[model samples]
Target: NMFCNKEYCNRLKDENNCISNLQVEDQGNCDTSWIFASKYHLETIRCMKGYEPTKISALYVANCYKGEHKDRCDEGSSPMEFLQIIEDYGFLPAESNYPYNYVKVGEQCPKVEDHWMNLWDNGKILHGKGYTAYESERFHDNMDAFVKIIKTEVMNKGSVIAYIKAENVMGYEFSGKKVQNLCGDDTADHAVNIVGYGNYVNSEGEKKSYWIVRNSWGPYWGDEGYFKVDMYGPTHCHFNFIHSVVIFNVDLPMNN
Candidate 1:
C-alpha cells in the first residue's frame, strides 16, 4: 500500500492482522497484472485549475508504495508498481506540458528531469536527439527509434510497449481554445500500458490496426483499463521513451 498517513497504515495493518483468515491475493502474480489501484484520483486533482500544490504533491506520493507516505515493510514493493501505474494511466510523455509524475516503488523520489519538449538539447538528449521543438514527423521518428532500442537492447523477450495520443502535435496549443478542444476530444493526453499484443477488428470491422496496451486508470477505464492502438498510426509516441515500459519474465525473478 502506497499511502502516507501513519494512522491509516496502522489501521490497515491491524485490519490485515485481524483478517488473517482472509487470503490476501497477490495481485502481481495474476496473469492480468493491475497497473494502478487506489481511490485518490491524482490525475483529476492535478488537472484542476488553481489546484493546491501541496495537496496535489501529497496525493501523488500517497499512491507510491515507497514514497514518504509509503508503508514500511521488511520487503519492499517492486519497481513494477511504479511502471504499472503509468502503463495503466497513459501519461503524456514527460513533456507536452502534462503535469503527471512518476515514483519508483520502495525508493526515494528522484529529482524531476525535463526532456520531452526540447528534443535537441544535448543535456536533455531524447534518444540522442533534441525533441523540444521538432515537427510532428521528426518527433514521431525519434520516438520510433527509441522504441527499437528498448525492444532490442533493454527488454527481455516477451516485453511489450505502448504510448499516448490525445492532441495533434502541430496545430494544438498548450493553453486556450486548442487545449480545451483537445481535452474535450475522446483522446486523453496520457496513455501507458504494455499488457499484451495481438490483432483485432474495429467496430467498423476493419482489419487495419493492431497493438495491445495496458492502462493504470483502474478497471473502470477503457477495455478494463486497457486500450488498443493501430500499429499503422502516423505517430509512435505510443511506444516512445522505450525505457519506461516495464519488462519482466514470469519464469525468473527480476534480479536474475
Candidate 2:
C-alpha cells in the first residue's frame, strides 16, 4: 500500500480513492506545476463522480491558455485562473494525443491540431465551461480554520491544489524526511497537491504532524515525488495560501 508507515489518510493508498490507482505527474524543468495540479485535481474529481478515468493533457493547456506572460510554460496560473481557462476553452485533449514535452522548457505555443479541434467541437471532450473556483482566503492570521478546512476538503473530496511560497523549499533534498523551511518570507510562488496528512514519530518517540505533499518533479525526486511538511511548525512551506475548485453540473457526451 502507499500509506505512510505512520497514521495517515493518503488518497493514493486508500482503497476507496477515486481512481483504481492514483499516480503523480512530472512537470520537468518547466514551471507547469499549476497546470499539473489543476489537471490532476479535476481528473480525480471526475473519476470520483463516476466519469471515465480519461487523462487530461497538460501539454495541450501549455500550448494554449496565454496567461499574463509571454512565455506560456513559465507563466504559471493560479488554480482560479486555470479554472477560467477550462471554462472558456473547454476540456483539453487526452494525454496520448498531446503528450508533455519534458525536455523543452519554454517553446512557442503550437497551433491547435485540426483533428483535435474537431473532437473538441463535437463535445467529445467535456469541459468545466460553466464552473468556477473558490480561492482560499489568507490564513496567515487564522491557522486553525485553515487546518480544519483543508482537512475536511481532502477527507470529503479528493485533493486540494496548494499554492505555496516554495523558494526556500525548491532546492532542498527530501528522502522521506520531515521537512521545515523557514528561510523565506510568506509569499506564494509554486503549486502542488496536498494529497494527505499524518504524524511522524522519531526515535525518541516525539510525534510530529505533517502534510503528505505530492510534487510534480517526477518520481526520482523526494520520496518517489512526495514529501512531508511540518504541519504545526512556524513555517509550513507556506502552503496555507491555496485554492479549491467549486463543483457544478455540466452535460456529458452520450458516449462518456
Candidate 3:
C-alpha cells in the first residue's frame, strides 16, 4: 500500500491551505511554462512561509528564454534552466513596471529598479528518474523513492514544477475529468505546478489518491485553472511526474 504510516490509509487528508491561495495566469500563445509555473511556485512558497510577493515584473523571467520566430516564449524548459534564468537575472520587477505582454518577445531584460526581491536562500534543481541515464543506472529505476521526494517536498515546502506529455492530453481537456497518465512517461510536453496531494475513493469503490496541481492555461478550464491528477493509481507512476526544485531561507524583512 502507498499509505504505509502517515494516517494516510483509507482516509481523506486535505492539508495544504496554500494550494488555494495559488493564482492562475494564462500563458496565452507563449511557450513559457517555466515562467508561469515558477511564478506560482515562488508566490505560494513565499505566501505560506510568511513572506509576500514583491510585486515584481512577470515578464522578467520569460525574457530570459523567449524568441522572435518559431514560437512566442520559444521552447519549454526544465525547472533548473528556469530557476537559472531568475538566478542570473536577479529579482524580478513589478507587474506595473514591466506588465506582461502575453506575446513572446526576444527582448532584453528590463532594467530592474532598486528594492527588487533579493531573498536568495541557496536554491537547487532536481531531475526525475527517466530523464537521466546516470540516474537509472544508479537508482535502478526506483520511482517509489521519487514520489516520496516529490510529496515530501510539496507538503513540507510549497508548490513544485512537474513535467507531462502534451499530446496525450490533447483530446481530454478543460474538464473535471481526472487525467489518466500522470506518469507522463514520454519525453514530456508541458510544465506545471504540483501544489499539494489528497486521498479519496473512486466510483469503483476503490481508494484513490491525487496530486493537487495548477496549470498555466488560464481560468477558463480545468477546475478554475487547476486539476487533481491521479497520483496513486494504476495510471499514475509517481516518477512520471518528472522533476522539481525547492528554495529556502527566504530573506523577509522583519515587520517590527
Give the winner by TM-score. Answer: 2
Predicted candidate 2 versus true structure: per-residue lDDT over 1-256, tens digit per residue? 5543334667666565454355667887777888887777666566545556666777777766655444656567666666666666765777766778765545555565666632232332235544434444455577666666666665544566776666646665535555542333445667777767876774457776677777787777777778777655544444333433343223444333
Residue pairs with colliding backbones in model 2 are none
Q: For model 1, what is the error of residue 48's alpha carbon versus the real structure, in angstroms, after optimal superposition?
A: 38
Provide the global lDDT of candidate 2 against the true structure: 0.61
lDDT, ranked from best to worst = 2, 3, 1
Give one digit per residue, the lDDT tens place, for model 1 in 205-244: 6644333344453444444444444444523234322123
TM-score per prediction, in order, is: 0.30, 0.72, 0.71
How much is 47 displaced in model 2, in angstroms? 2.5
Error of 2 at 242 (Å): 7.3
lDDT values, one for every candidate: 0.29, 0.61, 0.55
Tens digits of per-residue lDDT, candidate 3, 155-228, equal 54465666666553455443545644344443666777767666767767787667767788888767767777
Question: Hey, what RMSD does candidate 3 come out at?
Answer: 6.1
Per-residue error at 152 for model 1, in Å?
Answer: 6.1
